C-alpha cells in the first residue's frame, strides 16, 4: 500500500471519514488559466485565438484589401527562468503570428484576388508563467491575483428606504452587457417606471416599450390581466374570477346565483372564494360604482360614425359607460388593478408618457442620447437599432447571457449576445413582480453573482485592448493607396501590444510582488481572490456587507483566512477543493447521494445551483452502505442550516476540510480554536521564517505533504529509478527500464538551487533527502526546499513548552525562552541581502571602481581585491567598503550601518562596449569554466547513461563480453551482431550520441555567446556590480515568534538552562508560555496540540529507549505496530508485517524524535484518544506533570501543563525594528528630519501625540519638539553647540515650515503677514 520512500516516516493519521476525492493540484487556477491563454484553440474561444478571431480579418475602408489571420506560435524564450532572474529581464516568449494580406484588383468586379501574400510577423513578447504560477517580470517573481468582480448580466436590486425620506423602497434593475451601454429601469417614488441609459436623462419605460413596435393595446395586453364586462338587459353582468378577490374589501351587496354570498363591510375571506368556486359562480351583478374608476384596455370606436369614443388606457365614467352602451358595445375590457398585488405601474407611466406612437418615442430617445443635432427619421431608427440590437456594438458574453437567462427562470443558457424584445419584456415583468410583492431582490455578495477573472482572462483582455490600436493602424495603412508593395510587417507594429501587455504584467494593481518567506506563503499568495483592482470596488469605500462572509462562501472561499486591518474580506482566499466553473464562477464538489446511498460520484455544484438542492453536512455518520445513522440530519437547503430527514438529502460534502483554505487547514485542532484566533493563526503561519534546520511538526494535519509538493520549492522526481549520484548541488537519477523513452534514452539530472535570496530577503536552498542508490518513484520528492523536512511542510520547530506564569517574564503575551534554544541554533535563520553599486555616465565622464580612494587606510582596503571589489567570503561588518568608487572632481558602496555578514556572491554586469576590469574577467572565466563543465558533465554522465544502455541490450543477440572492451566504448556499433531490431537500436541509441556530438558543438558556443556578451542596462548606467551578504540572525529578546493557533508574543528573556523549570527527570522546559492567554483568547486548540505533542514525544522517547540499548527488531516492530493502532476506528491502518526488516530500523530512526501525528481539520483526534496515546507511553494521562522550580529547587504547586507545541518564528525581527537618531539629514522643501529607517530619519511626533503634551502642562517640552528638535534651522545648530558646551537651553525662534506656509498662502492672491 505504501511506497519505498514514504516508509521513511509515516505520519499516524487520525481521522474517521474516508476520503473520496484527494486534494487537487493546489495551483490549478493559475496554471489552468494561463494554459487557456497560451494554447492553440481549434474551436477558437479561449486566449489568443479568441482575440485574433475577434479582431481579424481587418478589411480596408477603401475597399480593396484585407488582412486575415492564419495561426500563431510562441517562440522559444531567449533565456529561461534562472538567468532571467539573474540578469533582471522578463521571462517571455516572442509571439509570431502568420498574417495573410489579400489584395483585391481594381478592374475586376467586387471580390477578386489579384495577389495574396503571407509571412510570419512578430508582434509583442508576452511573459510566460513558470512551472509554478510565478512570472519573472524584471528579475522579480510576481503573481497575478485572481479577481472577484460583478458578472455581466441583469441585476435586480433596491435601496432599502434610504432615499427621498419617504421610508419607501425603490426597486431597480440594471442590464450590464459585457460590451455596450447599460440599461437601467427604476421606480419613481410615485410608483412610476422609468428607463435610462448610461445614467442619462431619465425617461418613462413606455418610451422604450413603444420603440419596439408596441401600441398601447399590446402594452396593456402584456402587462395586465383583463376583466370582462358584459352589458346585458339588467345591470352590468360582469365576469369575475373568484380568486381575484383575495385581499379586497367588500363595499356592496355581493350577490350571485340567487344567493347573497358576501355582504358589504367584509374583507373577502378565503372560504368566500372556496364557496364561490364550489357553487361554480363566474358572472356577477355589480353596481355602477365599481366601474366608476376602472381603466379601459383597448380602443372602442362606434361601429357607424367611426369616431373615437374612449381612448386606450382611459378611466371609465358613468357618462362614458352611457356612450359605449349607446354605440352597441357589449364586451368591455378593463385592467385588473390592486393596491397590493397588481399595481397600475404601467398605466401611470403611460399617463406620464409624452409620446403616443413609435416615431415620437424613437425621437425622444435620440434627443435623450445626443442633445442638439436636430433629429431625422433614420438618425433615430438606426441609432436605436444599433444601440441594443447590433452584434457589432452590443454583446452580452456567454456568462452574460447565462446569467440573463438564469435569473429570468429560463432554460436555454445560450443564445444571441444582443438583447431581444422578449428579454427587455421579461426584465420589466420581473421588476414589476418584485415591486408587487412576489420574489426578492438580488444580493451582490452572492458568489453566484460574482465572477473570477484569473490570470489568463485579464491578460487576454489587456492583449485585446492593445490589439485594438494595432487594428486601427492596420486599417489606416490598408486604406491608404498603393498596396502592391506592402507586406504584413510595414503596417503592424509590436509596440502597442508589448506596451499594453508589459503594463499589465509589470505595474498593475493585481500583478503584485510575491510573498516568498515560506512555501506556504507562495502557495497561498497564488490562490488569493482579491475583490479589488480594476473593474472592482475601492479599499476604503467598501461597506460592511461586502466585507462579511456570506452563506454562499461554504466550499468556495475560506471564511477564516483573510487579512485584518484596512481590508478584511477584500483579499479573501480560495478554499481547498474549490474550482472555477466554465463561466468563471466558483464551484465546489459534492458526492451525489441517491435514494439512500452516499455514492462516490462527484458533481461540482456552482454557487447558484447549490441553493436548489439540499446538501448534507460534512461529518454525518454514514456506515458501510451510504446510509445515514440518524433520521434528523443537519443540512443546508438555501443558506439555512437545519435538520432534515434521511431520504430527503440530494448531496453530501466531499470532505470535512473543504470549508477552509490551504493555509487554515494546516492548523491542528482547528475545531477547538476560535475564529479570530484561527484567522490570526493562518495569517501568522504565512509569515514564518525558514530556519537553519527544518523540523517536522509532531502534530500536523496531513495537508503538509500536499503543500510541500504542490509548491515548487522541493525538487521532485519525474520518472522513477535509482539514485545514481547525490551531491550537495545536484541529484542524478538513472531512470528505470520501462519509463525510459526509446529515443533519447538518457537519465534525469536535477540541479538544486543553493543559497539564493527570496523576495523577503530570506534564504531559499534545496538539500538532498535521498541517499546514494535509493529506489525513488514517480512523483516522489528528492530535495527538500526551504523549511520542509522529508518533503512535508515544516515552517518552524516543535518545542517543549510549559503553560505557567514565570516571574512576570511572560506577563502579557511575552515568551520565556531557554538558553539551550539558542545553544542548539534551532531558530537561527539566514537572511541574504543584495547591494548594488552602479556606474553612472555623468559629467566629467564615468567613475572608476578601483581601490584607490582618498582618506582610507589599509585597515579599510584590507578586504577589497586588486580591482576594487570585495573578496568572496570576506566577513564584513557595518561601515566597511564593498565596492570602492570615487567621485569625479568617495562614492564607495558601504555596508548599511548595522548589518554584518559574509559576502557569498558578487555579480558584475557591464554594458555592450565597455572594457572590463580583471575582476569581471575573473568571474567571467570562472563562469565560463562551469558552462564547459556543466555541459560536459551533462554529456559525459549521459554518455555513461547511453553506453550502459548500449551494453544493456547486449545481454542477448550478439554477446561477446571480452570483445566489448577490446575497442573502447566509442565504437560499439560495427561489432558482430545480427542486423535486426536490436541492431536498429544500436544505430538509434548512438544516433542520439551523434546528435549529442552535435549538441555539444553548438550549446557550449551559445553559452559563450551569453556569458561574455554585454548585458542590457538602463540609459545612464555603464556597469553594475552586485554584492550578496548572508547574515545569521540567531534569536534575541524582541523577536516575535508565534504558534499555529494565533498566539503571538515577543520573546522577553533568554533565561539560562539551570533557571528553566525541570521535571522529575531533569529535562528542562524549553519555552514557558502564559496560561492567561487561553481563556480570554479562546484558542483551546493550543492546549490539545500540547497534550498531543507530549504524547507524540512519548512514543519517540520509548523508541529512543529501544534503540539506545540495542534491542531486537521484533521488539521495535511490535511497539511501532501498537503505536499506529489505538485509534477509535481510524482509517490509517498500516501493517508493519509487510516491512522488509530494514525499513523498520529506518522507520524507527526517523521516529526517535517523536512519532508524527496527522490531525485532519475537522476529523481531529478526540480527547479520549489523546489520553489513550498518553497511556501507551508511560506519561501521565492528565497531560500535566509535577514540575520543579529551576532556581529555588523546590516543587511548583498545582501540576502544570507541559508538551511539545510547534512554535514558529515570524518575520518581525527586532534587528530590523530598532532605530535611533540624534541628528542626521533633513528634508529639502521643509527643514524637518527625514522619515524612515533606510533614510536615517527621526520619529514623527504627530498631531495626535501633540495633544498629549498640551493635556499635560509640558509647554517647554512641546516647544522644543516642534522648533528646536525638528524645524527651526537657526536654533537647532545653536542647540548642538549648546548641548556639547554643557548648556541645556534653547533659543527657539520660528519653525521653518511656518515660513513655507506663508510663502504658499502668499503664492495665491492672499496677503498674510505678521503684526507688530
Amino acid at each position: 500500500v505504501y511506497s519505498y520512500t514514504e516508509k521513511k516516516r509515516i505520519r499516524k493519521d487520525f481521522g474517521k471519514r474516508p476520503q473520496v476525492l484527494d486534494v487537487p493540484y493546489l495551483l490549478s487556477i493559475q496554471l489552468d488559466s494561463f494554459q487557456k491563454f497560451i494554447e492553440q484553440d481549434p474551436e477558437g474561444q479561449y486566449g489568443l485565438e479568441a482575440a485574433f478571431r475577434s479582431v481579424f480579418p481587418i478589411q480596408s475602408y477603401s475597399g480593396n484589401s484585407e488582412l486575415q489571420y492564419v495561426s500563431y506560435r510562441l517562440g522559444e524564450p531567449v533565456f529561461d527562468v534562472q538567468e532571467c532572474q539573474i540578469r533582471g529581464v522578463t521571462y517571455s516568449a516572442p509571439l509570431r503570428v502568420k498574417l495573410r494580406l489579400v489584395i483585391y484588383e481594381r478592374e475586376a468586379p467586387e471580390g477578386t484576388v489579384k495577389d495574396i501574400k503571407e509571412q510570419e510577423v512578430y508582434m509583442g513578447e508576452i511573459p510566460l508563467m513558470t512551472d509554478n504560477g510565478t512570472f519573472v517580470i524584471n528579475g522579480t517573481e510576481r503573481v497575478i491575483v485572481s479577481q472577484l468582480h460583478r458578472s455581466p448580466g441583469v441585476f435586480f436590486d433596491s435601496d432599502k428606504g434610504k432615499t427621498h425620506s419617504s421610508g419607501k423602497v425603490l426597486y431597480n434593475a440594471r442590464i450590464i452587457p459585457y460590451r455596450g451601454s447599460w440599461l437601467d429601469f427604476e421606480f419613481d417614488p410615485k410608483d412610476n417606471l422609468f428607463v435610462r441609459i448610461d445614467r442619462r436623462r431619465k425617461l418613462p419605460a413606455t418610451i422604450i416599450l413603444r420603440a419596439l413596435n408596441y401600441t398601447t393595446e399590446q402594452i396593456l395586453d402584456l402587462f395586465f390581466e383583463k376583466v370582462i364586462f358584459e352589458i346585458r338587459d339588467n345591470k352590468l353582468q360582469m365576469e369575475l374570477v373568484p380568486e381575484r378577490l383575495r385581499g379586497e374589501t367588500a363595499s356592496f351587496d355581493i350577490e350571485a346565483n340567487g344567493k347573497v354570498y358576501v355582504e358589504k363591510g367584509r374583507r373577502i375571506t378565503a372560504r368566500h372564494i372556496r364557496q364561490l368556486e364550489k357553487d361554480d359562480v363566474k358572472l356577477i351583478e355589480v353596481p355602477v360604482e365599481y366601474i366608476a374608476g376602472k381603466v379601459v384596455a383597448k380602443d372602442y370606436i362606434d361601429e357607424s360614425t367611426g369616431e373615437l369614443i374612449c381612448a386606450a388606457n382611459m378611466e371609465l365614467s358613468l357618462d362614458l359607460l352611457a356612450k359605449l352602451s349607446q354605440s352597441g358595445h357589449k364586451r368591455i375590457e378593463t385592467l385588473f388593478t390592486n393596491d397590493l398585488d397588481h399595481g397600475p405601474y404601467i398605466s401611470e407611466t403611460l399617463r406620464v408618457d409624452p409620446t403616443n406612437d413609435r416615431l415620437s418615442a424613437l425621437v425622444e430617445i435620440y434627443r435623450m442620447m445626443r442633445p442638439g443635432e436636430p433629429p431625422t427619421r433614420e438618425a433615430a431608427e438606426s441609432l436605436f437599432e444599433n444601440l441594443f440590437f447590433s452584434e457589432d456594438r452590443y454583446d452580452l458574453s456567454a456568462v452574460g447571457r447565462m446569467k440573463f437567462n438564469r435569473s429570468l427562470l429560463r432554460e436555454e443558457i445560450e443564445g444571441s449576445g444582443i438583447l431581444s424584445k422578449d428579454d427587455i419584456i421579461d426584465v420589466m415583468k420581473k421588476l414589476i413582480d418584485i415591486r408587487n410583492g412576489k420574489g426578492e431582490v438580488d444580493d451582490i455578495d452572492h458568489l453566484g453573482n460574482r465572477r473570477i477573472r484569473s490570470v489568463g482572462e485579464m491578460a487576454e483582455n489587456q492583449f485585446r485592448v492593445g490589439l485594438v490600436r494595432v487594428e486601427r493602424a492596420v486599417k489606416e495603412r490598408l486604406s491608404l493607396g498603393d498596396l502592391d508593395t506592402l507586406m504584413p510587417q510595414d503596417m503592424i507594429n509590436a509596440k502597442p501590444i508589448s506596451a499594453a501587455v508589459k503594463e499589465f504584467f509589470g505595474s498593475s494593481q493585481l500583478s503584485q510582488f510575491m510573498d516568498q518567506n515560506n512555501p506556504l506563503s507562495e502557495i497561498t499568495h497564488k490562490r488569493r481572490i482579491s475583490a479589488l483592482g480594476p473593474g472592482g470596488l475601492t479599499r476604503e469605500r467598501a461597506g460592511f456587507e461586502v466585507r462579511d462572509v456570506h452563506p454562499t462562501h461554504y466550499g468556495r472561499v475560506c471564511p477564516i483566512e483573510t487579512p485584518e486591518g484596512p481590508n478584511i474580506g477584500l483579499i479573501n482566499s480560495l478554499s481547498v477543493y474549490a474550482q472555477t466553473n466554465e463561466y468563471g464562477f466558483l464551484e465546489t464538489p459534492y458526492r451525489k447521494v441517491t435514494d439512500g446511498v452516499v455514492t462516490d460520484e462527484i458533481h461540482y455544484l456552482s454557487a447558484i445551483e447549490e441553493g436548489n438542492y439540499v446538501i448534507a453536512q460534512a461529518n454525518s455518520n454514514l456506515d458501510e452502505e451510504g446510509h445515514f445513522v440518524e433520521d434528523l440530519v443537519t443540512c443546508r437547503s438555501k443558506g439555512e442550516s437545519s435538520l432534515f430527514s434521511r431520504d430527503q438529502v440530494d448531496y453530501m460534502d466531499v470532505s470535512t476540510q473543504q470549508v477552509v483554505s490551504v493555509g487554515a487547514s494546516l492548523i491542528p485542532f482547528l475545531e477547538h480554536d476560535d475564529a479570530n484566533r484561527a484567522l490570526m493563526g493562518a495569517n501568522m503561519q504565512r509569515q514564518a521564517v525558514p530556519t537553519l534546520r527544518a523540523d517536522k511538526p509532531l502534530v500536523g494535519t496531513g495537508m503538509e505533504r500536499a503543500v510541500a509538493v504542490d509548491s515548487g520549492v522541493t525538487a521532485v522526481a519525474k520518472r522513477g529509478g535509482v539514485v545514481q549520484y547525490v551531491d550537495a548541488s545536484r541529484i542524478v537519477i538513472k531512470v528505470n527500464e520501462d519509463e525510459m523513452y526509446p529515443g533519447e534514452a538518457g537519465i534525469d539530472i536535477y540541479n538544486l538551487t543553493k543559497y539564493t535570496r527570496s523576495n523577503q530577503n530570506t534564504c531559499i536552498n534545496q538539500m538532498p533527502c535521498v541517499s546514494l542508490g535509493e529506489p525513488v518513484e514517480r512523483g516522489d520528492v528528492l530535495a527538500d526546499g526551504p523549511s520542509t523536512d522529508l518533503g512535508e511542510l515544516a515552517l518552524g520547530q516543535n518545542m517543549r513548552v510549559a503553560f505557567m506564569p514565570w516571574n512576570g517574564y511572560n506577563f502579557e503575551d511575552s515568551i520565556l525562552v531557554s538558553e539551550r534554544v539558542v545553544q542548539e541554533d534551532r531558530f537561527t535563520t539566514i537572511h541574504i541581502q543584495e547591494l548594488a553599486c552602479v556606474s553612472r555616465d555623468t559629467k566629467l565622464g564615468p567613475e572608476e571602481i578601483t581601490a584607490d580612494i582618498p582618506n582610507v587606510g589599509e585597515a579599510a582596503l584590507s578586504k577589497l581585491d586588486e580591482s576594487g571589489i570585495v573578496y568572496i567570503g570576506a566577513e564584513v561588518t557595518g561601515g566597511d567598503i564593498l565596492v570602492g568608487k570615487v567621485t569625479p572632481k568617495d562614492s564607495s558602496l558601504r555596508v548599511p550601518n548595522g548589518v554584518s555578514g559574509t559576502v557569498i556572491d558578487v555579480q558584475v554586469f557591464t554594458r555592450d562596449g565597455v572594457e572590463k576590469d580583471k575582476r569581471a574577467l575573473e568571474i567571467e572565466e570562472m563562469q565560463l569554466k562551469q558552462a564547459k563543465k556543466d555541459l560536459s558533465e551533462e554529456l559525459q554522465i549521459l554518455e555513461a547513461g547511453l553506453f550502459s544502455r548500449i551494453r544493456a541490450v547486449l545481454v542477448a543477440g550478439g554477446v561477446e563480453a571480452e570483445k566489448l572492451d577490446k575497442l573502447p566504448r566509442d565504437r560499439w556499433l560495427e561489432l558482430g551482431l545480427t542486423d535486426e531490431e536490436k541492431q536498429n537500436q544500436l544505430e538509434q541509441l548512438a544516433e542520439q550520441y551523434d546528435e549529442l556530438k552535435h549538441e555539444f558543438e553548438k550549446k557550449l558556443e551559445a553559452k559563450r555567446r551569453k556569458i561574455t556578451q554585454g548585458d542590457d542596462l538602463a540609459p545612464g548606467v555603464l556597469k553594475i556590480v552586485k554584492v550578496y551578504l548572508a547574515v545569521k540572525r540567531r534569536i534575541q529578546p524582541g523577536d516575535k515568534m508565534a504558534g499555529r493557533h494565533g498566539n503571538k508574543g515577543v520573546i522577553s528573556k533568554i533565561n539560562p538552562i539551570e533557571d528553566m523549570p525541570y521535571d522529575e527527570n531533569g529535562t528542562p522546559v524549553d519555552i514557558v508560555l502564559n496560561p492567561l492567554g487561553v481563556p480570554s483568547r479562546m484558542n483551546i486548540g493550543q492546549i490539545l496540540e500540547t497534550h498531543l505533542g507530549m504524547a507524540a514525544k512519548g512514543i519517540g522517547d520509548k523508541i529512543n529507549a529501544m534503540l539506545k540499548q540495542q534491542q531486537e527488531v521484533a521488539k521495535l516492530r511490535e511497539f511501532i505496530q501498537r503505536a499506529y493502532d489505538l485509534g477509535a476506528d481510524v482509517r490509517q491502518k498500516v501493517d508493519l508485517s509487510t516491512f522488509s526488516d530494514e525499513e523498520v530500523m529506518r522507520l524507527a530512526e526517523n521516529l526517535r524524535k517523536g512519532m508524527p501525528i496527522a490531525t485532519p481539520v475537522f476529523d481531529g483526534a478526540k480527547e479520549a484518544e489523546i489520553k489513550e496515546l498518553l497511556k501507551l507511553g508511560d506519561l501521565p494521562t492528565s497531560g500535566q506533570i509535577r514540575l520543579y522550580d529551576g532556581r529555588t529547587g523546590e516543587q511548583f504547586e498545582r501540576p502544570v501543563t507541559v508538551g511539545y507545541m510547534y512554535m514558529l518564528k515570524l518575520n518581525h525581527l527586532v534587528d530590523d525594528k530598532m532605530h535611533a537618531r540624534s541628528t542626521g539629514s533633513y528634508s529639502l522643501v521643509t527643514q524637518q528630519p527625514l522619515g524612515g529607517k533606510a533614510q536615517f530619519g527621526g520619529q514623527r511626533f504627530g498631531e495626535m501625540e501633540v495633544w498629549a503634551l498640551e493635556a499635560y502642562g509640558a509647554a517647554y517640552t512641546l516647544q522644543e519638539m516642534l522648533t528646536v528638535k525638528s524645524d527651526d534651522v537657526n536654533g537647532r545648530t545653536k542647540m548642538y553647540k549648546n548641548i556639547v558646551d554643557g548648556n541645556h537651553q534653547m533659543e527657539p525662534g520660528m519653525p521653518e515650515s511656518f515660513n513655507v506656509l506663508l510663502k504658499e498662502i502668499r503664492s495665491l492672491g492672499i496677503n498674510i503677514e505678521l503684526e507688530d
Binding site: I560, E564, G569, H672, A675, L679, I1084
Partner: protein, 50 residues
C-alpha cells in the same frame, strides 16, 4: 439562527457551527476596524473645538 451551537470549545465544533462562528467573528473584526476609523475622527473633532 434557530439552531444554536451546542458544542463548547473543549469538544469539537463541526463544520456548520464553525461557519456560523465565523459569521459572527468576521462581523466583529470588520466592525472593530471601521469603528477605529470613526472614533479617530470623532476625537479629532472634539479636540479641535475645545
Amino acid at each position: 439562527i434557530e439552531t444554536p451551537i451546542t458544542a463548547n470549545f473543549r469538544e469539537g465544533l463541526n463544520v456548520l457551527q464553525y461557519f456560523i462562528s465565523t459569521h459572527g467573528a468576521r462581523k466583529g473584526l470588520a466592525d472593530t476596524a471601521l469603528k477605529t476609523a470613526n472614533s479617530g475622527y470623532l476625537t479629532r473633532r472634539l479636540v479641535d473645538v475645545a
